């Protein structure tokens, strides 16, 4: 029946990589690279005090699944002679005879992997003889669940009842020796695919048709102006309700989200395709929802969505965990099975996830999760700040050192989320009142002595971005903007001096009521449903048929050219909008001692005064006494212009508006873009390349290369309604008028600008990827992803650059 | 609202086994860790063991796992310290718990008196 | 295994003072600290979770603070039946789950 055993220990453990040369210290290779290295990492582990038991286990299963699991009902087991070589110089041989006895009264077959058809009478014993010879052990790397080298013993030759087998493959696709790599993984990575994946008859080929790629070509370029228009109308529909809620009632920000959810499902799932309904209940999971949903229920329904936004990530480690999530997710047809398993399972996930230090950090959520059978995710979040805010702030760390040409952006981002306050935007409140001070007040995140000088975040924002570009303004941005109670509330200070709570003291509420006001003005005004009508595509061609011209490993495309127009008609935008952005601006009646500021009390200016004081005047010379004589009059009539009852918002106003701003009506228009504006995609002999997600996967999409766009805006208007002024009551007005020129000068500016930055003939290069998808989540590029030639590694590093598996060395 | 309890001033002879009982009520008992801790009366506090919900797994202290056994009865929800007479010292005090995660509940404890 | 070291073993004050208690660890746990309240002759009250975390019942005078190693318990008015002994107990991993050598509030009046 049984056999003779001793080391049955089984248990073993995996490896680590080794890192070389100038690649970058993340090791995340996968196979080939290491092509002789595999023996000797091999013969290392079987020089290990651990490999015996591994080997004599392996040598168990195998002789209880082959041999006696397909008998021993009618056929005992004897194992008299039985023994290994397993030796130091890494050689090992083995013989053994195996004695069958059937107790029965029948003549029966014995069944084995092989063509073994022999008859045995009743009461005798069969034999069995098996030898093999020391040989090195063939290193073969099947697939793990994480997808990684199963490095497997193979005989070369062995003689099995006294027959010689080759090449013998030992207990295939299961195996007992459990040394793996965390760095070495399956598969061609993202290149070595590209000699055999595309050719002739390959996959790619076959699979792409000229009626679809030219339709794919089309439907790039439709979907994106689609979703162009479809964020324009969603963001603002929203502010929509934003605007016209009256102030007393705080607004979440997820509050008016499910008003108008229908948008976002049509945006998200015109984006990928099903991903509307994942959307459709995330928005939807918090208190606040009219139709409350738990998150099981929301995570239960569609899995494929959750899998793909996975592997869209760019973590490797999050790999391992889609190994175990079919197996989660196997035969459960509710979301009380689902709670009820990941209670079971709960066991088995405390510790993988508490002993993690980025995970120890996340150690509490997890845990209520489990507990409570009505977690929300929104209400979840609020309740912890801290580890969220300390994994952001990692994510955010790593983003602004990857692309630092928005150096200022990835910085402003940063200092949003240093107080606690922002995450409260998945928390119930006012969410205009909320963003202001997360925009609109000074901060002094730190506890030195005294940090309110750090300033609000839109003007650290200004002062990135115009760095150096203006000089004297700068003074001006000082004194309206840098120093204006509205963009900047300088916190602690407004309950200093007034303690009666005057209606000025309030700044909040007038700048709250500012923002409301430019808000419902853009949204309901400008971005009306009526505008929006008034923008489209027109085709053009639709018409040339492009054919794949191939040559062993590539396809072409014989002429590419695809050009669609876009008709802006009457593309209007209302006055009012910077009207309102003057509202921003600071309206007390100060102005005097600013423009003194700006003209006169500068740097240089000074310096060319003193420089005429002390000397100058070429040819007069000695009429020094009347120097002071003249430049007193000048600056007296440059002061008596100006009127002191009007403002800065005036005299920007008066540049901007023309007629003066008692006389504006916000129905006009100030900026008229209209005309067709077209897109001419072109080329000839464009290669064909199959385009990835980020981590392992079936499915596939493809892409164009270096496609030649040329984006071009001639015959198209861009003018000003108002280009000639009507100002009645000029700021500077008299015979030293200067506001007309202003004016004047700003028309220059901006027809030389849309000269410039407006069209400009331009060209540009890219790779048109697109994922082509069937009616059914049934997309045409796919591997099985079972066979050890069809798994693409996307972040595996190219062995082509140069790896070698030892320290480096 | 938990009550984990039962007994109080347990009596038990050398050489003979003993029973410890603690009856949890007022929750769900599918879904946190039974616990037993003992104190020695005013010394600090060791550890016995967790076995719950249904996974029937236990874990022991290394010091006490040949010495205590735990056993959960899960219709009428009560969790058992058995370690019987092993030591004669051992006359001391003991003290059933329930999951921390949510909030570390207790019992009033069970004073033992290893004596005739 | 993870020691957690608390200063000072004893602590006298007047009612109402603002006090605190200190437990230090070899190695940072994250988060996973507690502080537990138990007076002569019954079993522990937990106080505060999670070094961070407070919990419903006790009233709201306590409070806590947690870094790294360095974990601090704040009594912001003493009174008379907070008197006793207090344990911080890690939980960064669950063979036992060590309680401190004990601190016992006292008073001096």
């Known amino acids: 029946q049984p056999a003779a055993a001793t080391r049955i220990t089984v248990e073993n453990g995996t490896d680590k990589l080794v890192n070389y040369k100038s690649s970058p210290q993340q090791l995340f290779l996968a196979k080939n690279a290491l092509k002789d290295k595999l023996q000797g990492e091999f013969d290392k582990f079987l020089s290990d005090a651990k490999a015996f038991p591994a080997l004599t286990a392996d040598l168990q299963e195998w002789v209880d699944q082959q041999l006696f699991n397909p008998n021993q009902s009618f056929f005992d087991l004897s194992a008299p002679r039985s023994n290994f070589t397993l030796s130091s110089d890494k050689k090992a041989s083995l013989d053994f005879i195996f004695r069958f006895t059937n107790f029965t009264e029948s003549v029966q077959l014995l069944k084995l992997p092989e063509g073994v058809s022999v008859v045995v009478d009743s009461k005798q014993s069969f034999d069995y003889y098996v030898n093999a010879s020391a040989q090195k052990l063939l290193v073969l790397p099947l697939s793990l669940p994480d997808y990684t080298l199963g490095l497997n013993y193979m005989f070369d030759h062995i003689t099995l009842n006294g027959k010689v087998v080759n090449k013998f493959s030992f207990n295939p696709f299961k195996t007992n020796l459990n040394l793996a790599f965390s760095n070495v993984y399956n598969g061609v990575d993202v290149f070595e695919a590209q000699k055999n994946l595309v050719g002739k008859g390959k996959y790619l080929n076959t699979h792409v048709k000229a009626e679809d790629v030219k339709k794919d070509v089309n439907a790039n370029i439709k979907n994106q102006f689609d979703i162009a228009k479809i964020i324009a109308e969603l963001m603002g529909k929203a502010l929509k309700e934003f605007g016209n809620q009256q102030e007393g009632q705080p607004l979440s920000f997820l509050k008016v989200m499910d008003k108008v959810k229908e948008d976002f499902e049509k945006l998200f799932n015109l984006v990928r395709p099903g991903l509307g309904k994942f959307v459709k209940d995330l928005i939807q999971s918090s208190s606040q929802a009219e139709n409350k949903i738990t998150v099981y229920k929301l995570i239960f329904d569609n899995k494929k969505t959750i899998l793909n936004l996975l592997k869209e990530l760019s973590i490797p480690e999050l790999n391992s965990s889609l190994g175990l999530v079919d197996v989660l997710f196997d035969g459960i047809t509710d979301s009380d099975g689902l709670y009820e398993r990941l209670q079971s399972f709960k066991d088995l996930i405390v510790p993988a996830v508490k002993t993690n230090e980025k995970t120890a950090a996340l150690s509490p959520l997890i845990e209520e999760l489990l507990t409570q059978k009505d977690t929300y995710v929104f209400d979840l979040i609020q309740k912890h700040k801290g580890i969220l805010t300390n994994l952001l702030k990692n994510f955010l760390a790593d983003f602004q050192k990857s692309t630092p040409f928005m150096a200022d952006q990835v910085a402003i981002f940063t200092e949003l989320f240093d107080n606690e306050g922002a995450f409260d935007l998945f928390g119930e409140a006012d969410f205009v009142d909320k963003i202001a001070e997360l925009f609109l007040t000074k901060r002094t995140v730190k506890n030195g002595e005294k940090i309110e000088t750090k300033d609000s975040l839109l003007v650290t924002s200004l002062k990135s971005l115009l760095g150096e570009k203006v000089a004297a303004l700068g003074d001006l941005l000082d004194s309206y903007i840098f120093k204006n109670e509205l963009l900047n509330r300088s916190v602690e200070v407004a309950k200093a001096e007034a303690k009666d709570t005057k209606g000025a003291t309030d700044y909040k509420k007038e700048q709250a009521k500012a923002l409301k006001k430019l808000f419902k003005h853009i949204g309901e005004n400008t971005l009306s449903k009526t505008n929006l009508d008034k923008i489209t595509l027109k085709e053009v061609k639709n018409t040339e048929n492009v054919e794949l011209e191939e040559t062993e490993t590539t396809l072409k495309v014989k002429k590419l050219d695809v050009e669609y127009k876009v008709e802006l008609g009457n593309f209007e935008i209302k006055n009012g909008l910077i009207k309102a952005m003057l509202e921003f601006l600071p309206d007390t009646k100060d102005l005097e001692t600013t423009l003194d500021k700006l003209l006169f009390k500068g740097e240089s200016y000074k310096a060319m005064k003193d420089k005429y004081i002390k000397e100058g005047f070429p040819g007069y010379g000695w009429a020094k006494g009347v120097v002071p004589g003249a430049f007193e009059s000048i600056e007296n009539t440059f002061k008596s212009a100006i009127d002191k009852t009007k403002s800065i918002r005036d005299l920007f106003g008066d540049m901007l508006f023309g007629n003066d701003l008692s006389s504006v009506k916000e129905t006009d228009s100030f900026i008229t873009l209209g005309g067709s504006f077209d897109i001419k995609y072109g080329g000839e002999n464009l290669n064909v390349l199959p385009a990835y997600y980020s981590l392992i996967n079936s499915e596939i999409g493809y892409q164009i290369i270096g496609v030649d766009t040329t984006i071009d805006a001639t015959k198209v208007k861009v003018e000003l309604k108002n280009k000639e002024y009507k100002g009645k009551s000029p700021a500077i007005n008299g015979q030293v008028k200067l506001s007309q020129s202003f004016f004047n000068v700003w028309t220059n500016m901006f027809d030389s600008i849309t000269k410039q930055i407006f069209q400009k003939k331009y060209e540009f290069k890219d790779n048109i990827q697109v994922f082509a998808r069937n009616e059914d989540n049934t997309s045409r590029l796919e591997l099985d992803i079972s066979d050890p030639e069809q798994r693409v590694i996307p972040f595996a590093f190219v062995d082509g650059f140069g790896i070698q598996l030892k320290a480096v060395d | 609202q938990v009550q984990l309890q039962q007994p109080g001033a347990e009596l038990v002879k050398p050489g003979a086994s003993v029973k410890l009982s603690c009856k949890a009520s007022?929750?769900?008992?599918?879904?946190?860790?039974m616990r037993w801790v003992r104190q020695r009366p005013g010394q600090g506090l060791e550890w016995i063991g967790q076995?719950?919900?249904?996974?029937?797994?236990?874990n022991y202290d290394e010091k006490f796992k040949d010495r205590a056994t735990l056993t959960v009865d899960k219709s009428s929800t009560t969790a058992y310290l058995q370690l019987s007479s092993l030591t004669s010292d051992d006359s001391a005090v003991y003290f059933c718990?329930?999951?921390?995660?949510?909030?570390?509940?207790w019992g009033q404890g069970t004073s033992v008196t290893v004596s005739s | 295994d993870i020691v957690l070291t608390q200063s000072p073993a004893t602590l006298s004050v007047t009612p109402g003072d603002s006090v605190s208690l200190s437990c230090r660890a070899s190695?940072?746990?994250?988060?996973?600290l507690h502080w537990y309240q138990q007076k002569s002759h019954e079993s522990p009250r937990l106080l505060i979770k999670?070094?961070?975390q407070s919990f419903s019942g006790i009233p709201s005078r306590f409070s806590g603070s947690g870094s790294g190693t360095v974990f601090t318990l704040t009594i912001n008015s003493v009174e008379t039946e907070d008197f006793g002994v207090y344990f911080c107990?890690?939980?960064?991993?669950?063979?036992?789950?060590?309680f401190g050598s004990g601190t016992n509030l006292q008073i001096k009046r």
């Open positions: 190695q940072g746990i994250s988060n996973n």
């Open positions: 999670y070094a961070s």
């Open positions: 718990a329930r999951s921390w995660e949510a909030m570390d509940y």
């Open positions: 007022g929750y769900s008992f599918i879904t946190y860790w």
């Open positions: 107990q890690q939980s960064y991993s669950w063979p036992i789950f060590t």
């Open positions: 076995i719950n919900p249904s996974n029937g797994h236990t």
